[PDB]
Amino acid sequence: PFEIVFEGAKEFAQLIDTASKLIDEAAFKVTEDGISMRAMDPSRVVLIDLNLPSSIFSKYEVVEPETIGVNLDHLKKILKRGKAKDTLILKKGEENFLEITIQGTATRTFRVPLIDVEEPELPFTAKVVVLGEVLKAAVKDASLVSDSIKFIARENEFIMKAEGETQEVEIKLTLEDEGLLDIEVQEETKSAYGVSYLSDMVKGLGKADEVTIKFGNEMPMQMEYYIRDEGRLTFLLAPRV
Numbered sequence: 258p259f260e261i262v263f264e265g266a267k268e269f270a271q272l273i274d275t276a277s278k279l280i281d282e283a284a285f286k287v288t289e290d291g292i293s294m295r296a297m298d299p300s301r302v303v304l305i306d307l308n309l310p311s312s313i314f315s316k317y318e319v320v321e322p323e324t325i326g327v328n329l330d331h332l333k334k335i336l337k338r339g340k341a342k343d344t345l346i347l348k349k350g351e352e353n354f355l356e357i358t359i360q361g362t363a364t365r366t367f368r369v370p371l372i373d374v375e376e377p378e379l380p381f382t383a384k385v386v387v388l389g390e391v392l393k394a395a396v397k398d399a400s401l402v403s404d405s406i407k408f409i410a411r412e413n414e415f416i417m418k419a420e421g422e423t424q425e426v427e428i429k430l431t432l433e434d435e436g437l438l439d440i441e442v443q444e445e446t447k448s449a450y451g452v453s454y455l456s457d458m459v460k461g462l463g464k465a466d467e468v469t470i471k472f473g474n475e476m477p478m479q480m481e482y483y484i485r486d487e488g489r490l491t492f493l494l495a496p497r498v
Contacts, residue, residue: 258319258320258321258323258349258350258351259287259318259319259320259321259323259347259348259349260316260318260346260347260348260349261287261292261314261316261317261318261319261346261347261348262314262315262316262317262344262345262346262347263313263314263315263344263345263347264315264342264344264345265341265342265343265344265345266336266338266339266340266341266342266343266344266345266359266361267339267340267341267343268341268484269336269339269345270333270336270337270339271460271461272307272461272484272490273329273332273333273336274333274336274337274460274461275457275458275460275461275462275490276294276296276305276307276329277329277330277332277333278457278460279296279298279303279305279454279457279458280296280298280299280305280329281328281329281330282326282327282328282329282372282374283296283326283327283329283374284296284324284325284326284374285324285325285326285327286322286324287319287322287323287324287325287349288319288322289311289319289322290310290311291308291309291310291311291312291313291317292307292308292309293306293307293308293309294306294307295307296376297376298454300498301498302451302454302494302495302498303454303458303492303493303494303495304492304493304494305490305491305492306377306490306491306492306493307489307490307491308488308489308491309484309488310487310488312487313484313485313486313487313488315344316346323349325349325355325371326371326372326373326374327355327369327370327371327372327374328369328372331369331370332369335357335359335367335369336357336359338359338365338367339359339361340361342361343359343360343361344359344360344361345357345358345359346358346359346360353370353371354368354369354370354371355368355369355371356368357369377479377491377493379473379476379477379479380473380476381471381472381473381476381479382442382443382444382446382472382473382474383410383440383441383442383443383446383471383472383473384439384440384441384442384469384470384471385410385415385437385439385440385441385469385470385471386437386438386439386440386467386468386469386470387415387430387436387437387438387467387468387470388435388436388438388464388465388466388467388468389459389462389463389464389465389466389467389468389482390436390464390465391428391430391436391437392455392459392462392468393459393462393464394428395417395428395455396452396455396456396459397456398426398428399417399419399426399452399455400452400456402419402423402424402426403419403421403423403426403452404419404451404452405419405449405450405451405452406418406419406449406450406452406455407419407420407447407448407449408446408447408448408449408450408470408472408478409445409446409447410440410442410445410446410447410472411442411445411446412440412442413431413432413440414429414430414431414440415429415430415431415437415440416428416429416430419449438467446472446473446474447474447475448472448473448474448475448476448478448496449496449497450478450494450495450496451494454494455494458480458492458494462482466482467482467483468480468481468482469481469482472496475496475497476496477493477494477495477496478493478494478496479491479492479493479494480492480494
């Protein structure tokens, strides 16, 4: 059992919405230190890792640790009722359901039944930190133009393209551009990743959010952004499988 309160219902709704694009159900481990969730999509191409320390919640009371399983589509449907400034209260008692209350100027309560849900380390040579706007633009620009997007990183340049034979769209960044905050490269690095996976990964990403991307030559990419400074959502995406 526990009682957890998060200020900013919409933001929490965005995290769940994002995860639901990769998986239908997930297991959330709720301990005194915080909430964690790890999962791999059905295609075994992307791994999602979510960690929300108790420090980011305005109220965090856990009577007894527990791992609860939930259908993310059902959860998202309820959470989308929350406004940017609404407060979200999650309460779990002895029974198999989570009581969700959303309060702003008025209050609303819902139930989400629980379900039984069963089921990074690479030698990266490039690291970049960009504003979410750049990645959101990149995927929106690539969607129906190509199957994948080629990521290229050099000393003072980050490029997202797809060297091929179709109409070509490329986003280029240098440190002089506001979209690129940091770039560290050990050697020229290139890899390509699936466009539909990236579109899902950047779903609900804020345009002003700072996103760290780490990758290598023909290797997976690790994408990560923070939630309330201490929380974090991390993705590990295969370059090909």
